[PDB]
Amino acid sequence: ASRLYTLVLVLQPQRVLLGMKKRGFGAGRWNGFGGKVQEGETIEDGARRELQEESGLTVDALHKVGQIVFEFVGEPELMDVHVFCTDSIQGTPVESDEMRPCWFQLDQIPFKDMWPDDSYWFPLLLQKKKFHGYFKFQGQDTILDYTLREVDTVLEHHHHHH
Numbered sequence: 001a002s003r004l005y006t007l008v009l010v011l012q013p014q015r016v017l018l019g020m021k022k023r024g025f026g027a028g029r030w031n032g033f034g035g036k037v038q039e040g041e042t043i044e045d046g047a048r049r050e051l052q053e054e055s056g057l058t059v060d061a062l063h064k065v066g067q068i069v070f071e072f073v074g075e076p077e078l079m080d081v082h083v084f085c086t087d088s089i090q091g092t093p094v095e096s097d098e099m100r101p102c103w104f105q106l107d108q109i110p111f112k113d114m115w116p117d118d119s120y121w122f123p124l125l126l127q128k129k130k131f132h133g134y135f136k137f138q139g140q141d142t143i144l145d146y147t148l149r150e151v152d153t154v155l156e157h158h159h160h161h162h
């Protein structure tokens with residue numbers, strides 16, 4: 001099957017808010033906010049819930065800017081990653097036990113300290129281009145293949161449990 005995930009980028013005109021994973025899986029890397037969508041909540045609920053827990057921020061709105069599929073050789077469960085961005089935050093960013101938010105100038109993004117697929121789709125998100133992406137991995141993050149398309153509009157999946 002697949003597992004449903006959200007990824008949220010807080011993107012203001014000249015800077016982006018990323019979070020460093022503090023402990024555990026993927027520790028020491030910077031990424032957007034998000035996580036697994038739980039049963040009982042919609043995709044948008046999960047994205048809002050993760051951003052609140054990981055950064056302490058509330059959002060007025062989330063823009064659907066991308067979809068990514070992660071596939072790992074051996075695992076029959078793909079990752080269905082719904083990607084959102086937003087520039088209408090409320091509150092002050094404050095770390096959780098899991099993530100610490102920090103602002104980054106758009107021309108100083110630390111790609112070497114982020115997940116490898118970010119080097120592909122993150123520049124498209126930075127240029128306000130919507131995208132559909134697929135990445136096949138082996139191991140933690142070794143890309144075997146990928147395809148990345150710019151889209152006019154992000155296609156809806158019509159998840160009826162989320």
Ligand SMILES: C[C@@H](Oc1cc(-c2cnn(C3CCNCC3)c2)cnc1N)c1c(Cl)ccc(F)c1Cl
Pocket residue numbers: 005006007026031032035036070072075079081115116117118139140141
């Ligand atoms: C923050 C982000 O980091 C990534 C994790 C992964 C990832 C997560 N898990 N794995 C595998 C590690 C071992 N093999 C099974 C999963 C790779 C791939 N690309 C990423 N950008 C991430 C994570 Cl950590 C989890 C779910 C997501 F939808 C996203 Cl977008």
Ligand SMILES: [Zn+2]
Pocket residue numbers: 038039161162
């Ligand atoms: Zn479900």
Ligand SMILES: [Zn+2]
Pocket residue numbers: 011063065084085086087
């Ligand atoms: Zn946006």
Ligand SMILES: [Zn+2]
Pocket residue numbers: 004080082157159
């Ligand atoms: Zn989906």
